[PDB]
Write a protein that binds this ligand. Structure first.
Ligand SMILES: Nc1nc2c(ncn2[C@@H]2O[C@H](COP(=O)(O)OP(=O)(O)O)[C@@H](O)[C@H]2O)c(=O)[nH]1
Ligand SMILES: [Mg+2]
Ligand SMILES: [Mg+2]
Ligand SMILES: [Mg+2]
Length: 161
């Protein structure tokens, strides 16, 4: 079964490590850089290899090997902080530079602390670079399992086409 690499991108403090923890175990706490999980979508089984930055985005020392050979990139931003959504342009630039033809997904984390703005992605990038957007909350787990399931489904469908 194929192994598809999914990287977590975004600024420091949006909830990338919390999403990574939720992936490994459905846990929230107020290890390794990558974790593999097996999904079956219809006929095809795929192993999603989710990567976390390891806190290296705090010193802006995310190496180019983090983006290389990435089948997908999840741009995570906090729904209560509008700067985290504005700063995604640099991360998308690095992704495209080191891994073109990569599926870009958008994650709006901390949906329990928004009630800020960022209600419209407003075509952050064109030519349908964004495959789909998601609103998650690592504290309550809302929309996380659905997000990863839909990501696996979309990339199985894309690799079959
Ligand atoms: N309420 C709420 N808090 C969150 C959520 N995700 C993360 N946090 C909080 O944000 C803090 C830092 O998040 P962190 O995992 O370090 O994000 P990262 O460093 O960007 O990967 C943690 O202490 C969490 O308690 C969420 O979905 N909802
Ligand atoms: Mg982190
Ligand atoms: Mg970085
Ligand atoms: Mg800031």
């Amino acid at each position: 079964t194929p192994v598809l690499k999914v990287i977590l991108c975004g600024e420091y403090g949006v909830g990338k490590s919390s999403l990574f923890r939720r992936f490994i175990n459905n846990t929230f706490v107020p290890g390794l850089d990558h974790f593999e999980k097996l999904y079956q979508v219809a006929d095809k089984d795929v192993k999603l290899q989710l990567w976390d930055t390891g806190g290296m985005e705090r010193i802006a020392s995310v190496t180019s090997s983090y983006y290389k050979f990435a089948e997908a990139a999840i741009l995570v931003f906090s729904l209560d902080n509008a700067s985290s959504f504005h700063i995604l342009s640099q991360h998308l630039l690095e992704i495209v530079s080191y891994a073109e033809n990569a599926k870009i997904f958008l994650c709006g984390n901390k949906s329990d602390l928004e009630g800020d703005a960022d209600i419209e992605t407003f075509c952050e990038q064109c030519h349908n670079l964004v495959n789909s957007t998601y609103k998650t909350s690592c504290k309550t787990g809302k929309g996380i399992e659905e997000m990863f399931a839909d990501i696996a489904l979309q990339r199985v469908e894309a690799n079959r086409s």
